[PDB]
């Protein structure tokens, strides 16, 4: 197990997944906050240069919410009509007054069914 962690700041992390072509997927990402006057900013990226941040407009839409109840923020990433181009390696950058944290995940895109299924191979149920 090559996983090392120690009292990380980024409470929750956006666990990558696999969305079908044309489907809509959302990610979760929370951060430990102490102050209220200040608010941390999150920037979503993709590929090498592709910055989802600027891509957010139609096919993509980001989300952000604050919870003074626990002083923790929760940023989400709503991806609409996920195209085969949305697949690859994602990245997250959150620069907070206190400390900064970054996390990256993986996203997969499967071809949405269109025409009748072809000869398959394997067991079935139901």
């Amino acid at each position: 197990g090559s996983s090392g962690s120690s009292g990380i700041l980024f409470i929750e992390k956006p666990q990558g997944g696999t969305v079908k072509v044309g489907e809509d997927i959302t990610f979760i990402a929370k951060v430990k906050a102490e102050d209220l006057l200040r608010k941390p900013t999150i920037k979503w990226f993709k590929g090498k240069w592709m910055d989802l941040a600027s891509k957010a407009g139609k096919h993509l839409q980001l989300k952000e919410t604050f919870e003074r109840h626990s002083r923790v923020y929760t940023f989400e990433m709503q991806i609409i009509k996920a195209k085969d181009n949305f697949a690859g390696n994602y990245r997250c950058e959150v620069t907070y007054k206190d400390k900064f944290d970054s996390c990256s995940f993986d996203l997969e895109v499967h071809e949405s069914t269109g025409t009748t299924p072809n000869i398959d191979s394997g067991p079935s149920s139901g």
Side-chain angles (χ1 to χ4, degrees):
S2 54
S3 199
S5 297
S6 204
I8 50 168
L9 208 81
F10 215 46
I11 293 177
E12 210 73 320
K13 306 153 87 88
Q15 294 81 19
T18 311
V19 64
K20 197 70 70 62
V21 169
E23 271 185 26
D24 68 273
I25 180 155
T26 316
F27 305 86
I28 297 299
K30 270 149 278 187
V31 65
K32 199 84 210 272
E34 303 172 300
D35 202 52
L36 308 189
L37 286 300
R38 319 277 81 83
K39 167 197 293 161
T41 310
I42 187 152
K43 201 86 73 207
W44 305 80
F45 285 90
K46 173 67 184 57
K48 211 278 165 71
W49 320 76
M50 210 198 100
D51 179 29
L52 306 176
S54 332
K55 306 291 190 201
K58 266 170 276 176
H59 290 302
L60 170 90
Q61 292 283 292
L62 314 174
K63 217 92 156 78
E64 162 191 318
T65 197
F66 170 60
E67 275 182 43
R68 31 262 213 196
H69 308 91
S70 199
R71 297 210 210 204
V72 177
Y73 294 85
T74 303
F75 314 79
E76 311 152 314
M77 179 162 71
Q78 218 183 132
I79 301 207
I80 322 91
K81 309 203 198 277
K83 322 161 200 194
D84 90 298
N85 159 298
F86 288 59
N89 181 228
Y90 281 59
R91 188 152 194 181
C92 306
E93 283 168 30
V94 180
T95 327
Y96 186 40
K97 319 323 209 181
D98 279 76
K99 294 282 194 88
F100 153 104
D101 54 63
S102 72
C103 38
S104 54
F105 60 85
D106 51 86
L107 189 285
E108 279 162 300
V109 189
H110 287 204
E111 290 207 277
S112 170
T113 57
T115 189
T116 49
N118 307 100
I119 300 160
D120 282 294
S121 59
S124 188
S125 289

